[PDB]
Symmetry: C3
Subunit: 200 residues, 3 copies
């Protein structure tokens, strides 16, 4: 009939290996005295210093914020700042051995129709990769049909090369989810780190 | 490196997919015109004939068609076919109209990548991606390209931007949507215009 | 213009694998009590399906995409994996599912789910492999499930999850409002379980 032994399966594994290591699980814990998870989501390690972007609604009223990396390391995180208007928050973790960081191509712009992968921790199932495309822009938000669920907020939306296109945030309905464009997220992050708040 | 993308199909076809609005009098209040329902449509040729779904325009007191390039028109119902749930509209434009790419010899195959183009929940034109899941579903294509209220009457195109069908309705089931195949849609349209 | 271009398509995977995926019907004394899918694993007529689909069946019917319809015999089942092995006896040759024992599934690989959701007739849906097992304790309670966003609905259980080459990656389980979260028993395990149920 046919022998597919030497053929190559169509795959986005390259984007996964490049980006997924930098996407963390974020847990919002509350203190009767025992510390339990109140809500959860994802976050993206933006640079070597341990700065991480996540959504503000994921960390609101946390008595403790925990960050878990795909490689097994767990950290208690410091809340650097947050911004309600963009629903973004920045965390800081103090790691010793080096941290994986999300690929960022400063010159790339998402285009409608681009294939994208959503990376997050839906329903605490553990890191999950889902695929779709950029459905619309301007919304400003990117819209995508890459399946997003509770637990994906604050995680990454990357293209087939693993470059960050945005930070998943909202899920409207089938296949309607939104991400904050990476240019805006990066700008808000720098302001939160520099000023501790977004001056407008 | 080049990101994998269906942006070419989008640029070739999305310009011809319109936002359709069915406005009716609010007879429970003061008969003021208000949006009763909405969907999408596909501009089929330069004369301004547009295919949409019959259920989207049923009982409209006024049919509005909005193009992605900013132009807005009031449209006229040419006719409909309840069996296929298709309707044809006509707008009178000047300056030229974007039209949907049609390859009359392309045969849709199960597994072909498709993009559904429409206006779900009136959020503005939205592109979703899936494949052709089955055919002859009776003459209907089935697809897992996400379809939502607002997509009805819009275009289902392949990665080249060629029209594969007119999205009609989705079967909580996930990823089950149907479209009238383009050959049939076209035959029905010419008949409604003609007779 | 686009006359000579070629539409992106997974029709090849479909042509290679879909003929071997069957519609399974569990009938009870009186009609249809429940339905699902199955995968013909070899020419002798051995078929894998899920145990829950055939539990308590008075008569198990198997329908092929080529239009042949058979009454199947239950060879055995395993509630752990929720797999059942059926046997049909046919005069004509039988289409079998492509199996590449050396293929290692990767997170990010494109996959097609093939089954009979809602008894609409065989349906192909596309997604990617979202995860290949879990190292820690998690909601599935298990460690080797393949997870995928290829749309899975009632009727898909027991059907095939294949890659773009048509190679069997796994057997889709019961349907999991979450969106794009579905699970399959990896093919290496399904193959081993089937052999054990056939021999003893």
């Amino acid at each position: 009939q046919f022998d597919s032994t030497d053929e190559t399966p169509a795959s986005y594994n390259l984007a996964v290996r490049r980006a997924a290591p930098a996407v963390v699980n974020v847990y919002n814990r509350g203190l009767h005295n025992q510390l339990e998870i109140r809500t959860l989501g994802s976050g993206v390690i933006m640079d070597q210093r341990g700065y991480i972007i996540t959504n503000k609604h994921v960390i609101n009223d946390a008595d403790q914020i925990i960050v878990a990396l795909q490689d097994g390391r767990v950290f208690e995180a410091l809340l650097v700042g947050s911004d309600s208007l963009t629903d973004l928050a920045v965390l800081k973790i103090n790691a010793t051995g080096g941290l994986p960081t999300i690929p960022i191509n400063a010159r790339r712009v998402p285009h409608i129709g681009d294939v994208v992968l959503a990376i997050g921790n839906p329903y605490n199932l553990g890191q999950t990769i889902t695929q779709g495309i950029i459905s619309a822009t301007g919304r400003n938000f990117l819209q995508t049909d890459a399946s997003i669920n509770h637990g994906n907020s604050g995680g990454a939306l990357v293209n087939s090369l693993g470059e960050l296109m945005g930070i998943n945030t909202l899920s409207f309905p089938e296949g309607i989810g939104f991400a904050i464009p990476f240019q805006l997220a990066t700008k808000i992050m720098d302001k939160l780190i520099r000023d501790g708040r977004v001056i407008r």
